[PDB]
Protein backbone atom coordinates (compact mmCIF):
# COMPACT_ATOMS: atom_id res chain seq x y z
CA UNK A 1 0.00 0.00 0.00
CA UNK A 2 2.49 2.61 -1.19
CA UNK A 3 -0.43 5.01 -1.72
CA UNK A 4 -0.17 6.06 1.93
CA UNK A 5 3.35 7.40 1.43
CA UNK A 6 2.28 9.24 -1.72
CA UNK A 7 -0.14 11.35 0.35
CA UNK A 8 1.68 11.44 3.71
CA UNK A 9 5.19 12.75 4.30
CA UNK A 10 7.42 9.87 5.46
CA UNK A 11 9.35 12.16 7.82
CA UNK A 12 6.16 13.55 9.37
CA UNK A 13 4.42 10.16 9.40
CA UNK A 14 7.31 8.53 11.28
CA UNK A 15 7.64 11.46 13.69
CA UNK A 16 3.90 11.31 14.36
CA UNK A 17 3.77 7.52 14.58
CA UNK A 18 6.87 7.33 16.77
CA UNK A 19 5.54 10.02 19.10
CA UNK A 20 2.14 8.32 19.17
CA UNK A 21 3.56 4.89 19.98
CA UNK A 22 5.89 6.32 22.62
CA UNK A 23 3.02 8.28 24.17
CA UNK A 24 0.81 5.18 24.03
CA UNK A 25 3.50 3.08 25.71
CA UNK A 26 3.99 5.64 28.47
CA UNK A 27 0.24 5.85 29.01
CA UNK A 28 -0.24 2.08 29.23
CA UNK A 29 2.70 1.64 31.62
CA UNK A 30 1.20 4.31 33.86
CA UNK A 31 -2.22 2.65 33.63
CA UNK A 32 -0.60 -0.48 35.06
CA UNK A 33 1.14 1.53 37.78
CA UNK A 34 -2.23 3.02 38.78
CA UNK A 35 -3.60 -0.42 39.62
CA UNK A 36 -1.77 -1.88 42.65
CA UNK A 37 -2.38 -5.34 41.19
CA UNK A 38 -0.04 -4.59 38.27
CA UNK A 39 2.23 -2.07 40.06
CA UNK A 40 5.51 -3.91 39.55
CA UNK A 41 7.42 -1.12 41.31
CA UNK A 42 6.07 -2.43 44.63
CA UNK A 43 8.47 -5.35 44.27
CA UNK A 44 8.02 -8.99 43.30
CA UNK A 45 7.65 -10.01 46.97
CA UNK A 46 5.17 -7.24 47.79
CA UNK A 47 2.79 -8.11 50.62
CA UNK A 48 0.14 -5.61 51.77
CA UNK A 49 0.40 -4.63 55.41
CA UNK A 50 -1.87 -6.61 57.73
CA UNK A 51 -4.46 -4.59 59.63
CA UNK A 52 -5.33 -6.01 63.05
CA UNK A 53 -7.13 -4.96 66.23
CA UNK A 54 -9.56 -2.66 64.46
CA UNK A 55 -7.00 -0.79 62.37
CA UNK A 56 -8.27 1.17 59.37
CA UNK A 57 -5.89 2.53 56.75
CA UNK A 58 -8.18 5.44 55.91
CA UNK A 59 -10.35 7.63 58.13
CA UNK A 60 -14.09 7.21 57.77
CA UNK A 61 -15.71 9.46 55.19
CA UNK A 62 -18.73 9.57 52.89
Amino acid sequence: LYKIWLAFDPRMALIGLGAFLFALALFIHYMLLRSPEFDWLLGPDYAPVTLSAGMSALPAGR
Binding site: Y30, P48, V49, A53, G54, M55, S56, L58, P59, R62
Partner: protein
Amino acid sequence: CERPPPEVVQKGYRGVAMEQNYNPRLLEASIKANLPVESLPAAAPGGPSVSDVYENVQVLKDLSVAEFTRTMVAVTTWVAPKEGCNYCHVPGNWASDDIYTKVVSRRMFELVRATNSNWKDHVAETGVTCYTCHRGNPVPKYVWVTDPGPNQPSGVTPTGQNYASSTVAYSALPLDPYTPFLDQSNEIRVIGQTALPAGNTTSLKQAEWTYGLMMQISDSLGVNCTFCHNSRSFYDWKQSTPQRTTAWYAIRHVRDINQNYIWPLNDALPASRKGPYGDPFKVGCMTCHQGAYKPLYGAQMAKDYPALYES
Protein backbone atom coordinates in the same frame (compact mmCIF):
# COMPACT_ATOMS: atom_id res chain seq x y z
CA CYS B 1 6.92 14.52 43.37
CA GLU B 2 4.34 11.75 43.78
CA ARG B 3 2.38 9.76 41.29
CA PRO B 4 -1.42 9.65 41.00
CA PRO B 5 -3.99 8.56 41.99
CA PRO B 6 -4.14 9.18 45.74
CA GLU B 7 -6.61 7.48 48.03
CA VAL B 8 -9.23 10.17 48.66
CA VAL B 9 -11.69 10.22 51.56
CA GLN B 10 -14.65 12.56 51.13
CA LYS B 11 -15.78 14.19 54.38
CA GLY B 12 -18.10 17.00 53.32
CA TYR B 13 -20.75 17.70 50.72
CA ARG B 14 -20.00 17.06 47.06
CA GLY B 15 -18.30 19.97 45.33
CA VAL B 16 -17.21 21.52 48.64
CA ALA B 17 -13.84 19.71 48.36
CA MET B 18 -13.57 18.65 52.00
CA GLU B 19 -11.42 15.61 51.29
CA GLN B 20 -8.37 13.76 52.60
CA ASN B 21 -5.73 12.80 50.04
CA TYR B 22 -3.43 9.88 50.84
CA ASN B 23 -0.58 8.66 48.71
CA PRO B 24 -1.18 4.88 48.86
CA ARG B 25 2.54 4.07 48.98
CA LEU B 26 3.26 6.75 51.59
CA LEU B 27 0.23 5.51 53.52
CA GLU B 28 1.54 1.95 53.28
CA ALA B 29 4.91 3.06 54.65
CA SER B 30 3.25 4.99 57.48
CA ILE B 31 1.07 2.05 58.51
CA LYS B 32 4.04 -0.33 58.62
CA ALA B 33 5.72 2.16 60.96
CA ASN B 34 2.62 2.38 63.20
CA LEU B 35 1.78 -1.28 63.72
CA PRO B 36 0.48 -2.32 67.15
CA VAL B 37 1.91 -4.99 69.42
CA GLU B 38 -0.01 -8.25 69.72
CA SER B 39 -1.79 -8.46 73.06
CA LEU B 40 -0.44 -10.87 75.65
CA PRO B 41 -2.53 -13.97 76.38
CA ALA B 42 -5.23 -13.36 78.96
CA ALA B 43 -4.22 -13.86 82.58
CA ALA B 44 -5.67 -16.80 84.47
CA PRO B 45 -8.75 -15.72 86.47
CA GLY B 46 -8.50 -16.00 90.23
CA GLY B 47 -5.37 -16.51 92.26
CA PRO B 48 -3.64 -14.31 94.82
CA SER B 49 -4.45 -10.62 94.90
CA VAL B 50 -1.95 -7.79 94.55
CA SER B 51 -3.07 -6.12 97.77
CA ASP B 52 -2.25 -9.07 100.04
CA VAL B 53 0.92 -10.23 98.20
CA TYR B 54 2.83 -7.12 97.09
CA GLU B 55 4.11 -4.36 99.36
CA ASN B 56 4.32 -1.07 97.46
CA VAL B 57 1.61 -1.18 94.79
CA GLN B 58 -0.16 2.19 94.93
CA VAL B 59 -1.99 2.33 91.57
CA LEU B 60 -2.56 -1.24 90.34
CA LYS B 61 -3.73 -2.52 93.75
CA ASP B 62 -7.12 -3.63 92.39
CA LEU B 63 -5.65 -6.39 90.20
CA SER B 64 -4.81 -10.03 90.77
CA VAL B 65 -1.22 -11.24 90.72
CA ALA B 66 -1.79 -12.98 87.38
CA GLU B 67 -3.06 -9.80 85.73
CA PHE B 68 -0.45 -7.69 87.53
CA THR B 69 2.34 -9.94 86.24
CA ARG B 70 0.85 -9.75 82.75
CA THR B 71 0.76 -5.95 83.00
CA MET B 72 4.43 -5.76 84.00
CA VAL B 73 5.41 -8.03 81.10
CA ALA B 74 3.43 -5.84 78.71
CA VAL B 75 4.78 -2.48 79.89
CA THR B 76 8.25 -3.99 79.61
CA THR B 77 7.59 -4.62 75.92
CA TRP B 78 5.94 -1.21 75.54
CA VAL B 79 8.50 1.01 77.30
CA ALA B 80 11.82 -0.76 77.95
CA PRO B 81 12.15 -3.94 75.87
CA LYS B 82 15.90 -3.57 75.35
CA GLU B 83 16.64 -2.46 78.91
CA GLY B 84 14.36 -5.17 80.26
CA CYS B 85 12.63 -5.43 83.61
CA ASN B 86 15.43 -3.63 85.49
CA TYR B 87 14.85 -0.32 83.70
CA CYS B 88 12.15 0.70 86.19
CA HIS B 89 13.24 -1.37 89.20
CA VAL B 90 16.11 -1.61 91.66
CA PRO B 91 17.66 -5.06 91.09
CA GLY B 92 16.61 -7.46 93.83
CA ASN B 93 14.01 -5.10 95.35
CA TRP B 94 10.81 -4.75 93.33
CA ALA B 95 9.05 -2.66 95.98
CA SER B 96 11.85 -0.07 96.05
CA ASP B 97 11.02 3.34 94.58
CA ASP B 98 14.61 4.62 94.70
CA ILE B 99 14.87 4.99 90.93
CA TYR B 100 13.32 7.82 88.93
CA THR B 101 11.87 5.53 86.26
CA LYS B 102 9.80 3.72 88.89
CA VAL B 103 8.40 7.02 90.18
CA VAL B 104 7.73 8.34 86.67
CA SER B 105 6.17 5.11 85.41
CA ARG B 106 3.83 4.93 88.41
CA ARG B 107 2.57 8.40 87.50
CA MET B 108 2.43 7.21 83.88
CA PHE B 109 0.03 4.45 84.92
CA GLU B 110 -2.26 7.08 86.43
CA LEU B 111 -1.94 9.06 83.19
CA VAL B 112 -3.04 6.11 81.06
CA ARG B 113 -5.76 5.04 83.49
CA ALA B 114 -7.18 8.57 83.66
CA THR B 115 -7.02 8.83 79.87
CA ASN B 116 -8.81 5.55 79.20
CA SER B 117 -11.63 6.35 81.63
CA ASN B 118 -12.09 10.14 81.72
CA TRP B 119 -11.19 11.24 78.18
CA LYS B 120 -13.42 9.05 76.02
CA ASP B 121 -14.58 12.22 74.28
CA HIS B 122 -11.13 11.94 72.67
CA VAL B 123 -9.89 8.34 72.87
CA ALA B 124 -13.39 6.84 72.40
CA GLU B 125 -12.98 3.26 73.63
CA THR B 126 -9.76 2.85 71.66
CA GLY B 127 -7.93 4.09 74.74
CA VAL B 128 -4.19 4.45 75.07
CA THR B 129 -1.42 2.12 76.14
CA CYS B 130 2.15 2.84 77.23
CA TYR B 131 3.05 1.69 73.71
CA THR B 132 0.91 4.43 72.11
CA CYS B 133 3.59 7.02 72.94
CA HIS B 134 6.71 5.04 73.76
CA ARG B 135 6.51 2.50 70.90
CA GLY B 136 9.13 0.37 72.62
CA ASN B 137 11.38 3.31 73.52
CA PRO B 138 11.97 4.59 77.07
CA VAL B 139 11.83 8.15 75.69
CA PRO B 140 8.87 8.74 73.34
CA LYS B 141 10.13 9.71 69.91
CA TYR B 142 7.79 12.68 69.38
CA VAL B 143 7.94 15.02 72.36
CA TRP B 144 8.30 18.78 72.58
CA VAL B 145 9.88 21.40 74.82
CA THR B 146 9.43 25.15 74.81
CA ASP B 147 11.44 26.16 71.76
CA PRO B 148 13.64 29.28 72.05
CA GLY B 149 13.73 29.26 68.25
CA PRO B 150 16.86 29.97 66.24
CA ASN B 151 19.76 31.65 67.98
CA GLN B 152 19.46 35.42 68.08
CA PRO B 153 21.96 38.20 68.82
CA SER B 154 21.94 39.07 72.50
CA GLY B 155 20.22 42.41 71.85
CA VAL B 156 17.56 41.05 69.46
CA THR B 157 14.17 40.01 70.81
CA PRO B 158 13.13 36.70 69.20
CA THR B 159 10.01 36.73 67.06
CA GLY B 160 9.53 32.97 67.30
CA GLN B 161 8.66 32.81 63.60
CA ASN B 162 9.93 33.65 60.11
CA TYR B 163 12.11 30.55 60.18
CA ALA B 164 11.58 27.26 58.37
CA SER B 165 10.50 24.74 61.00
CA SER B 166 9.06 21.24 60.78
CA THR B 167 6.92 22.08 63.82
CA VAL B 168 4.67 24.16 61.55
CA ALA B 169 5.05 21.83 58.55
CA TYR B 170 7.96 23.87 57.13
CA SER B 171 6.08 27.16 56.89
CA ALA B 172 7.29 30.48 58.32
CA LEU B 173 4.50 30.47 60.92
CA PRO B 174 5.28 30.85 64.66
CA LEU B 175 7.38 27.74 65.21
CA ASP B 176 6.40 27.00 68.84
CA PRO B 177 2.62 26.62 69.06
CA TYR B 178 2.93 23.88 71.68
CA THR B 179 3.72 26.14 74.63
CA PRO B 180 0.79 28.62 74.46
CA PHE B 181 -1.83 26.08 73.38
CA LEU B 182 -0.88 22.51 74.35
CA ASP B 183 0.66 23.40 77.73
CA GLN B 184 -0.87 26.77 78.58
CA SER B 185 -4.52 27.49 77.76
CA ASN B 186 -4.24 30.49 75.44
CA GLU B 187 -7.33 31.18 73.36
CA ILE B 188 -7.14 29.47 69.98
CA ARG B 189 -10.15 31.25 68.47
CA VAL B 190 -9.30 34.45 66.61
CA ILE B 191 -12.21 34.85 64.19
CA GLY B 192 -15.03 37.24 65.02
CA GLN B 193 -18.48 35.67 65.11
CA THR B 194 -20.45 38.70 63.94
CA ALA B 195 -20.70 40.19 60.46
CA LEU B 196 -19.85 43.68 61.70
CA PRO B 197 -17.16 44.56 64.27
CA ALA B 198 -18.38 44.03 67.83
CA GLY B 199 -15.25 44.33 69.97
CA ASN B 200 -13.14 41.39 68.78
CA THR B 201 -9.69 42.92 69.27
CA THR B 202 -7.72 39.79 68.35
CA SER B 203 -4.65 40.76 66.35
CA LEU B 204 -3.83 39.39 62.92
CA LYS B 205 -0.59 38.13 64.48
CA GLN B 206 -2.66 35.94 66.81
CA ALA B 207 -4.21 34.28 63.76
CA GLU B 208 -0.71 33.25 62.68
CA TRP B 209 -0.24 31.56 66.06
CA THR B 210 -3.49 29.63 65.64
CA TYR B 211 -2.44 28.84 62.06
CA GLY B 212 0.86 27.52 63.41
CA LEU B 213 -0.96 25.33 65.91
CA MET B 214 -3.28 24.04 63.20
CA MET B 215 -0.31 23.22 60.98
CA GLN B 216 1.11 21.13 63.82
CA ILE B 217 -2.26 19.48 64.50
CA SER B 218 -2.74 18.55 60.85
CA ASP B 219 0.84 17.31 60.53
CA SER B 220 0.46 15.24 63.70
CA LEU B 221 -2.66 13.51 62.37
CA GLY B 222 -1.43 13.34 58.77
CA VAL B 223 -4.57 15.16 57.63
CA ASN B 224 -5.39 18.50 56.04
CA CYS B 225 -7.50 21.37 57.35
CA THR B 226 -10.72 20.03 55.82
CA PHE B 227 -10.46 16.95 58.05
CA CYS B 228 -12.11 19.11 60.72
CA HIS B 229 -13.01 22.43 59.06
CA ASN B 230 -14.97 23.84 56.20
CA SER B 231 -12.35 26.39 55.19
CA ARG B 232 -14.99 28.86 54.01
CA SER B 233 -15.82 29.34 57.71
CA PHE B 234 -13.13 28.06 60.08
CA TYR B 235 -14.99 29.35 63.15
CA ASP B 236 -18.25 27.57 62.35
CA TRP B 237 -18.96 24.36 64.25
CA LYS B 238 -22.13 23.69 62.25
CA GLN B 239 -20.09 23.25 59.05
CA SER B 240 -17.22 21.40 60.74
CA THR B 241 -16.73 17.64 61.07
CA PRO B 242 -17.13 15.43 64.16
CA GLN B 243 -13.34 15.14 64.23
CA ARG B 244 -13.20 18.83 65.13
CA THR B 245 -15.19 18.07 68.29
CA THR B 246 -12.79 15.25 69.11
CA ALA B 247 -9.81 17.52 68.44
CA TRP B 248 -11.31 20.11 70.79
CA TYR B 249 -11.30 17.60 73.64
CA ALA B 250 -7.86 16.38 72.61
CA ILE B 251 -6.47 19.89 73.13
CA ARG B 252 -7.89 19.97 76.65
CA HIS B 253 -6.74 16.37 77.15
CA VAL B 254 -3.16 17.21 76.15
CA ARG B 255 -3.17 20.26 78.42
CA ASP B 256 -4.34 18.00 81.24
CA ILE B 257 -1.54 15.53 80.48
CA ASN B 258 1.16 18.20 80.34
CA GLN B 259 0.00 20.32 83.28
CA ASN B 260 -1.10 17.59 85.71
CA TYR B 261 1.14 14.63 84.82
CA ILE B 262 4.29 15.66 82.95
CA TRP B 263 4.99 18.96 84.72
CA PRO B 264 4.80 17.66 88.33
CA LEU B 265 7.32 14.96 87.32
CA ASN B 266 9.89 17.55 86.25
CA ASP B 267 11.94 17.33 89.46
CA ALA B 268 12.19 13.53 89.23
CA LEU B 269 13.32 13.53 85.60
CA PRO B 270 17.03 13.91 84.79
CA ALA B 271 18.50 16.89 82.98
CA SER B 272 18.51 14.94 79.70
CA ARG B 273 14.69 14.91 79.78
CA LYS B 274 14.39 18.71 79.85
CA GLY B 275 14.54 21.44 77.25
CA PRO B 276 16.74 24.53 77.19
CA TYR B 277 14.13 26.39 79.27
CA GLY B 278 14.14 23.60 81.85
CA ASP B 279 10.71 22.22 80.98
CA PRO B 280 10.40 18.43 80.64
CA PHE B 281 9.70 16.58 77.43
CA LYS B 282 5.98 17.13 76.94
CA VAL B 283 3.12 15.48 75.09
CA GLY B 284 1.83 16.84 71.80
CA CYS B 285 -0.60 15.56 69.22
CA MET B 286 2.33 13.94 67.41
CA THR B 287 3.32 11.99 70.54
CA CYS B 288 0.43 9.53 70.11
CA HIS B 289 -0.78 9.99 66.53
CA GLN B 290 2.72 10.11 65.00
CA GLY B 291 1.41 11.19 61.61
CA ALA B 292 -1.82 9.17 61.57
CA TYR B 293 -5.43 10.27 61.98
CA LYS B 294 -5.60 7.78 64.86
CA PRO B 295 -2.67 6.41 66.87
CA LEU B 296 -1.61 3.07 65.37
CA TYR B 297 -4.34 3.70 62.77
CA GLY B 298 -7.04 2.92 65.31
CA ALA B 299 -5.52 -0.27 66.72
CA GLN B 300 -7.26 -1.33 69.93
CA MET B 301 -4.69 -2.41 72.53
CA ALA B 302 -5.90 -0.92 75.82
CA LYS B 303 -9.05 -3.05 76.11
CA ASP B 304 -6.93 -6.19 76.61
CA TYR B 305 -5.30 -4.76 79.76
CA PRO B 306 -7.66 -3.96 82.66
CA ALA B 307 -4.74 -2.38 84.53
CA LEU B 308 -5.01 0.60 82.16
CA TYR B 309 -8.48 1.68 83.35
CA GLU B 310 -9.45 3.45 86.55
CA SER B 311 -11.41 1.50 89.15
